[PDB]
Design a protein around this ligand. Structure first.
Ligand SMILES: [Ca+2]
Ligand SMILES: [Ca+2]
Ligand SMILES: [Ca+2]
Ligand SMILES: [Ca+2]
Ligand SMILES: [Ca+2]
Ligand SMILES: [Ca+2]
Ligand SMILES: [Mg+2]
Ligand SMILES: [Mg+2]
Ligand SMILES: [Mg+2]
Ligand SMILES: [Mg+2]
Ligand SMILES: [Mg+2]
Ligand SMILES: [Mg+2]
Ligand SMILES: [Mg+2]
Ligand SMILES: [Mg+2]
Ligand SMILES: [Mg+2]
Length: 290
């Protein structure tokens, strides 16, 4: 019943994914996207400095999916990371990792393209990973790499998934991820940000993620989060801490879309209630003391 040998080719891989997807009540395309993300995360995990510490930390929706699993996180598309040092050399190192491969997977990476974010000195970069399993194309993963901000790469959590073990690839998965205090700080900044006039803030989905991250902190002391928040809002030098969690007129349906598949969770069911919940969390963070 549990595959003893790894898949022999892509067809057997997809074949096995579809069976695991139905087996645990998940959409096939999501499980396959999840596996593609894990493969690229394992490439990233081979990148270390000369003391063995990670060079790349995962963040964004990929990290939330690793923390909570597929059923309890939003479906997200990209592989967002923070580069611990020198961003230009990350691409070359990933390309080498993908050429060497991991458990039969290989990757070719497209050229990095800068993107403008006013609050960051060094601009993030975006590119794509073209994944193949035993020579035959498998999936495509959008990748975003941003430079370190304050102490958001000082520490990392190490997360796992058994998805590849379920289709017969047993090699252990261990993914360094940006810690929750810094995820909260950056999402709070993004969801409360006022963009330059032409652009508009669409990030109502961050209201879902912030509720999920708050729940993941359980009873933890909020002082690390408060410090991280203060550090991000000051480094970025835009709107100050603590922010106001305002809702824009087009967010009701964007927030509703972000709830898709999460009916079983205890979440705010309207954007107003979501804004009120995240505003309470902001105040709870601000009250923390050493
Ligand atoms: Ca994040
Ligand atoms: Ca994902
Ligand atoms: Ca810091
Ligand atoms: Ca909590
Ligand atoms: Ca106001
Ligand atoms: Ca609505
Ligand atoms: Mg599951
Ligand atoms: Mg290590
Ligand atoms: Mg994602
Ligand atoms: Mg830690
Ligand atoms: Mg940690
Ligand atoms: Mg799984
Ligand atoms: Mg827009
Ligand atoms: Mg629905
Ligand atoms: Mg409920």
């Amino acid at each position: 019943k549990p595959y003893s040998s790894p898949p022999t080719n892509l067809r057997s891989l997809r074949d096995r994914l579809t069976q695991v997807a139905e087996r645990q009540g998940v959409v096939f395309g999501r499980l396959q996207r999840h596996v593609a993300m894990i493969v690229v995360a394992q490439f990233a995990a081979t990148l270390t400095d000369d003391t063995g510490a990670p060079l790349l930390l995962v963040k964004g929706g990929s990290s939330l999916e690793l923390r909570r699993g597929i059923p309890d996180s939003r479906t997200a598309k990209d592989f967002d990371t923070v580069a611990r040092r020198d961003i230009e050399l990350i691409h070359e190192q990933l390309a080498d990792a993908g050429e060497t491969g991991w458990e039969g997977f290989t990757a070719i990476f497209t050229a990095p393209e800068e993107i403008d974010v006013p609050g960051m000195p060094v601009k993030p970069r975006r590119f794509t990973a073209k994944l193949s399993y035993r020579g035959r194309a498998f999936a495509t993963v959008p990748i975003e790499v941003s430079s370190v901000e304050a102490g958001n790469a000082d520490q990392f959590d190490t997360l796992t998934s058994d998805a590849l073990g379920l289709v017969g690839v047993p090699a252990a998965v261990a993914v360094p991820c940006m810690t929750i205090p810094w995820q909260i700080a950056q999402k709070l900044h993004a969801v409360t940000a006022v963009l330059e006039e032409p652009k508009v803030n669409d990030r109502a989905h961050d209201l879902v993620d912030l509720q999920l991250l708050e729940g993941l902190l359980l009873d933890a002391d909020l002082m690390p989060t408060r410090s991280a928040c203060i550090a991000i809002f000051e480094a970025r030098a835009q709107h100050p801490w603590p922010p106001r969690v305002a809702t824009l007129p087009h967010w009701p349906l964007i927030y509703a879309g972000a709830l898709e598949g999460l009916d079983h969770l205890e979440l705010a069911r309207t954007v107003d209630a979501a804004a009120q919940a995240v505003q309470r969390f902001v105040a709870r963070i601000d009250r923390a003391t050493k």
